[model samples]
Target: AEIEVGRVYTGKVTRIVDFGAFVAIGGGKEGLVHISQIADKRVEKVTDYLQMGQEVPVKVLEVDRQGRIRLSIKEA
Candidate 1:
C-alpha cells in the first residue's frame, strides 16, 4: 500500500551512512530516516541510532512533488 501522509509505521534499517539510514517499508519502497530523525537530541552520528536490520518506527511527515516521502521519529 502507498504510505499515507502522517501515517506511522515501523521499518527495518536496510543501510546506514554517516548522514542517515535507509528504512525499508516493503513493496520496494525505501525512505530515508535522516540523522535529524533518529532522535530528539543532537545526533553526532547516524550510526548512533541505527544499524542494518534494526527496526524503527517513523511517522510519515510529507510526500513531496517528486514523490519523496519525508519521515520523522522525533516530531511531535
Candidate 2:
C-alpha cells in the first residue's frame, strides 16, 4: 500500500524528539510530526503527547520538497 496526500492515517511512532516524532507511515517512508503541527493544551513536550511504538493518526498536510514532509493533525 501507498500513502496518499492530504489524508489521515495511523502510523507507528518510531522515534520522538523535542520538536517532533518520526513516524513510519508507509514503506520506507518515515515522516515527521512536528510539535508545531500537533494541536493541544499542555503540549509543551513532544514526549508527553507521543511515545516510541505508539500508533498515532496524523495527516500529511504537505509532501513538500524532495526527501521531506510537512505533516499535521486536526480537530476539524
Candidate 3:
C-alpha cells in the first residue's frame, strides 16, 4: 500500500523547521512530524534530534484530502 497508516516507511528529511521537519515519503509526498510527535524529551534544536537530510523511517499518522501527510517517528 502507498504510505498507509500504521505502517513504517523510510523517508528522507528534506527540510527542518521549529515545529518539525518535512520528510519525503512515497511519491512526492512530504509529511510533517510535529514537535510533540518526535520525542518524549523536549528538544532544544529539532535538527539535533533529527538530522537534516537524514534517513529515518516514520509511521503514517494521518492523511488529508489535500494529500498533506502527518507522521510520527516516535511510534516508528
Candidate 4:
C-alpha cells in the first residue's frame, strides 16, 4: 500500500541530527521524526532516543507532494 499520513510502520534509524532522526521505511523511503516527535518526554538529544541502525516504530504525521515524510514516534 502507498504510504500515507497517519500510517504506522516499523523502520530503522539510518541517521541522527540535533533536530531529528531519519528513518528508512518500506520501499527504501526515508522519513523525518523531528526532535519533538521522538518521545513523550522532552527530548534534549536525538542520540539519546535513537542510534544508528536502531529499529523504531513510527507514525506518519504528514506527507508532502514530493513525498517528504513527516513522522512521529511519540504520537503512537
Better of 1 and 3 by lDDT: 1
Residue 66, candidate 1: alpha-carbon lDDT: 80
Provide the clashing-pair count of each candidate structure. Answer: 0, 0, 0, 0
Please report the candidate that would top TM-score against the real structure.
1
Arranged by TM-score, best first: 1, 4, 2, 3
Q: Over the stretch 1-76, how does candidate 2's per-residue lDDT look in tens digits? A: 5566877766667877777656667676766756765566646777866678767776776776685765565431
Cα displacement (Å) at residue 4, model 2: 3.0
Candidate 2 residue pairs that clash: none
Write candidate 3's Cα lDDT for 42-67 as tens digits: 76566776676677777777787977
The residue-by-residue lDDT of candidate 1 on 1-76, one tens digit each, is 6646767767678877777766767765667777767777777788877778777777777778987767666432
Q: Considering summed lDDT, which 10 consecutive residues are worst modelled in model 1?
A: 67-76
Residue 73 displacement in candidate 1 (angstroms): 1.8
Preferred candidate (TM-score higher): 1 or 2: 1
lDDT of each: 0.71, 0.65, 0.67, 0.71
lDDT computed for candidate 4: 0.71
Q: TM-score for all predictions? A: 0.80, 0.73, 0.71, 0.76
